[PDB]
Amino acid sequence: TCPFYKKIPGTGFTVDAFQYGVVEGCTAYFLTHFHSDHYAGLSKHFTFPVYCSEITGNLLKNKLHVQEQYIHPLPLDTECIVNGVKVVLLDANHCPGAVMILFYLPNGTVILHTGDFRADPSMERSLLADQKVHMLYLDTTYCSPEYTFPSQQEVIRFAINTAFEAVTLNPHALVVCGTYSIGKEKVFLAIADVLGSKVGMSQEKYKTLQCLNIPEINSLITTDMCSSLVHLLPMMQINFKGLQSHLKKCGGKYNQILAFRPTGWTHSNKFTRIADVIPQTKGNISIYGIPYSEHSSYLEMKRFVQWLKPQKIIPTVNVGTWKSRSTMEKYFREWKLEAGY
Ligand code: NI
Numbered sequence: 001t002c003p004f005y006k007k008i009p010g011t012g013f014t015v016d017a018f019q020y021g022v023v024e025g026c027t028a029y030f031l032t033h034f035h036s037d038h039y040a041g042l043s044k045h046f047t048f049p050v051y052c053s054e055i056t057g058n059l060l061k062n063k064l065h066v067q068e069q070y071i072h073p074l075p076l077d078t079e080c081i082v083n084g085v086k087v088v089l090l091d092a093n094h095c096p097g098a099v100m101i102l103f104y105l106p107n108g109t110v111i112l113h114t115g116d117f118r119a120d121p122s123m124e125r126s127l128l129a130d131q132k133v134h135m136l137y138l139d140t141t142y143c144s145p146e147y148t149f150p151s152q153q154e155v156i157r158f159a160i161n162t163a164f165e166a167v168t169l170n171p172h173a174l175v176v177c178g179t180y181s182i183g184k185e186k187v188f189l190a191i192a193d194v195l196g197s198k199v200g201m202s203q204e205k206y207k208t209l210q211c212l213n214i215p216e217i218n219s220l221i222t223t224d225m226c227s228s229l230v231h232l233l234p235m236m237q238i239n240f241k242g243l244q245s246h247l248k249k250c251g252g253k254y255n256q257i258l259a260f261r262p263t264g265w266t267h268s269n270k271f272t273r274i275a276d277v278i279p280q281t282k283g284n285i286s287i288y289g290i291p292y293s294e295h296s297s298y299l300e301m302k303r304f305v306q307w308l309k310p311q312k313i314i315p316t317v318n319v320g321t322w323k324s325r326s327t328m329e330k331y332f333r334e335w336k337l338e339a340g341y
Pocket residue numbers: 033035094116
């Protein structure tokens with residue numbers, strides 16, 4: 001059944017709750033972003049109101065074929081009324097079109113649902129600064145102190161410098177980047193920019209990117225693989241067998257592959273710095289795992305929460321085990337006692 005952490009009390013609303021059939025008593029279904037664990041269940045047969053950002057609504061229409069009459073896009077940073085309740089959508093610093101949602105309940109309670117987010121100090125100067133938030137529905141993906149990672153900026157600098165050096169040493173090297181969802185577009189776009197190439201990809205992936213309102217996108221991507229020396233492939237194909245295979249396909253235009261796998265966290269983060277990352281190499285193929293995250297580190301999450309000072313926290317991630325739930329509740333109490341709320 002629909003879990004309690006997907007329901008907004010005092011409303012007829014649900015958040016990211018599309019795989020339970022008709023939720024009894026739901027008058028409006030919000031969708032925070034276009035990732036499959038969140039939209040799971042939506043299709044052209046859906047006939048209830050879906051509230052979301054403009055970009056998420058472009059992806060619902062073009063990729064899932066949801067009918068336009070049930071898509072209700074809202075602008076960001078704007079007080080809107082939905083079924084009689086004031087809501088605001090805020091940028092979540094996750095993937096394109098990802099939002100946090102502020103609900104102003106008739107009884108005076110204010111609720112923030114983060115969806116998926118990467119907390120950032122810039123959020124402390126949004127509309128969130130203007131009133132007290134009582135309850136926080138929190139993306140707790142990396143809520144444990146082992147989870148450190150560098151800034152997105154540091155990681156993109158590494159990737160750009162690595163690619164540029166490799167291709168300038170060998171003009172017949174191909175760069176490949178893995179993907180299995182929207183997000184992390186900076187990785188492949190930043191690399192293609194430094195090399196003066198467009199990024200080449202499948203017709204399905206190009207269609208997905210043309211939904212994202214990225215400025216000048218027609219100048220940066222293409223379905224012509226032959227003209228491009230940065231290719232995007234399914235994350236599944238980013239291994240030696242898949243890459244050897246791909247290289248055969250290019251007809252001896254290239255003699256070397258440099259590949260990037262933008263992972264979330266991986267246990268080399270506890271020991272090794274970004275400056276010290278190395279690839280796995282077999283023959284003329286090298287694969288780099290780079291820790292490009294679109295979720296809060298532990299310290300970023302802690303700073304946001306200690307700033308916000310909520311009265312109650314409801315985790316939305318890692319909720320399936322008693323050991324995880326208990327560990328998270330221990331950190332929440334530490335944070336509250338340290339900061340004095
Ligand atoms: Ni997500």
